[PDB]
Amino acid sequence: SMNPPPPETSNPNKPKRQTNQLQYLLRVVLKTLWKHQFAWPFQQPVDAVKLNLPDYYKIIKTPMDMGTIKKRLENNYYWNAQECIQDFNTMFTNCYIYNKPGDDIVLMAEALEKLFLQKINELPTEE
Numbered sequence: 001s002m003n004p005p006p007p008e009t010s011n012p013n014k015p016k017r018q019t020n021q022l023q024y025l026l027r028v029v030l031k032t033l034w035k036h037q038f039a040w041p042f043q044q045p046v047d048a049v050k051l052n053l054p055d056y057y058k059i060i061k062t063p064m065d066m067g068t069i070k071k072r073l074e075n076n077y078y079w080n081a082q083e084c085i086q087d088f089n090t091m092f093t094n095c096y097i098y099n100k101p102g103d104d105i106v107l108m109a110e111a112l113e114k115l116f117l118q119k120i121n122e123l124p125t126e127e
């Protein structure tokens, strides 16, 4: 099985805006998670070919990853903070669905999710 193309990240038929919360989601939330010691399995789409996981896209139909989230923020793909927050949550949920409890990858996702939830409790004020 081939990999699917990565999720869309820059769509010129979507309107674009800068907001306090979107800027914080890139500069603080994404940045803080990206630097974590266990972020690396989440910094790009799952390469099912390279990783020999031929059933990955048979099970996960809404893939998401921080590399895609980063590019979506950089190219104004999101209009509302909730869209970005939803993508981070989809990333974590996919990890929990595909893998088993206690697997190294799941323990890594749990550590990142704890940090994510802390940082999104500190969003700046909305316009």
Ligand SMILES: COC[C@H](C)n1c(-c2cn3c(C)nnc3c(NC(C)C)n2)nc2cnc(N3CCOC[C@@H]3C)cc21
Binding pocket: 040, 041, 042, 046, 051, 053, 094, 095, 098, 099, 104, 105
């Ligand atoms: C700790 O993850 C190891 C794992 C193999 N792995 C994942 C990954 C990401 N996943 C998400 C998201 N949800 N489920 C999985 C998942 N599940 C499997 C464990 C069943 N694996 N992404 C990776 C990216 N790169 C690499 N490496 C590049 C450098 O050389 C070495 C190695 C090949 C390994 C990667």
